[PDB]
């Protein structure tokens, strides 16, 4: 159940004339392609982005996408003309297409459409259909779009056959990048809490890859259950950043440590004690005026 391949399309329609479509492609949490509106061709963001496909096979798909992008734009504009009072610019459409890969040549495909930020339409089997909660007026556009047997046939091709095949090539060719292990670097800080005489201890953890990580404030072998893990934040070099906070009363700091478990570390956890020789020296280099 290892990997999700995602083609993400972002289409903005301001008015009857102005429009742009930009796309990005992801395998897991690594970016493989980008497609700007002003770019005629799909760009590779990795050396292995073409997968196992030949130059002829790639050019064939690229040509198909070029026709589609232009065709999508006008089709939406026509639907607005058709839908009239119901809908009207500005229009924001997000499209998420791809497949989830599994061990043993097993695959599931998907094509999801969001309208004005809300998930409204999916391609299922042989045709478009509304999802629960979708506005009732979508019934007509879906009927109209489902009358296009040609578009449907190519969608089915890309979903049933082209995704699973292409992704498998991507998984093989990008093996070294997908299986990379980058070591986390941890450092400590603190700020005053809203409560008087209380402090919030912050354990910063940066530069780790892959994403799964374990961070807890500790007093000896005792996990501090007041530890609040933050959100995973991306770094520019395709690594992750995370911080865990803990609320203590002034004086409680001594004896506490931030512990970090990560696959790149082996079995050798990073243990960072609050009062440490290194923390003291690193804090000296961190001083500022606020």
């Amino acid at each position: 159940k290892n990997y999700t391949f995602r083609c993400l399309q972002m289409s903005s329609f301001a008015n009857r004339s102005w429009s742009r479509t930009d796309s990005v492609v992801w395998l897991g949490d690594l970016q493989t392609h980008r497609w700007s509106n002003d770019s005629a061709t799909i760009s590779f963001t990795k050396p292995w982005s073409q997968g196992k496909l030949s130059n002829q096979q790639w050019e064939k798909l690229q040509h198909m996408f070029q026709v589609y992008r232009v065709s999508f734009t006008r089709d939406i504009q026509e639907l607005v003309k058709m839908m009239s009072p119901k809908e009207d610019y500005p229009i924001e459409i997000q499209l998420s297409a791809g497949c989830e890969m599994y061990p043993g040549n097993a695959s599931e495909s998907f094509l999801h459409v969001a309208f004005q930020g809300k998930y409204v339409v999916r391609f299922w089997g042989t045709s478009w259909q509304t999802v629960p909660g979708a506005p009732s007026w979508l019934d007509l556009p879906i009927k109209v779009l489902n009358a296009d047997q040609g578009t449907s046939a190519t969608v089915q091709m890309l979903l049933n056959d082209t995704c699973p095949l292409f992704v498998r090539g991507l998984l093989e060719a990008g093996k070294s990048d997908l299986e990379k292990q980058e070591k986390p670097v941890a450092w400590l800080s603190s700020v005053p809490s809203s409560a008087h005489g209380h402090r919030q201890l912050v354990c910063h953890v940066s530069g780790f890859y892959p994403k799964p990580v374990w961070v807890m404030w500790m007093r000896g072998d005792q996990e501090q259950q007041g530890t609040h893990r933050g959100d995973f934040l991306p770094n520019a070099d395709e690594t992750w950043y995370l911080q865990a906070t803990l609320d203590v009363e002034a004086g409680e700091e001594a004896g506490l440590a931030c512990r970090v478990k990560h696959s790149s570390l082996g079995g050798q956890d990073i243990i960072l004690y609050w009062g440490s020789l290194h923390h003291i020296l690193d804090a000296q280099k961190m001083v500022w005026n606020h």
Partner: peptide
């Protein structure tokens, strides 16, 4: 959200 890539050292 604003954060540094590496431990800040003046």
């Amino acid at each position: 959200q604003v954060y540094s890539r590496h431990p800040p050292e003046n």
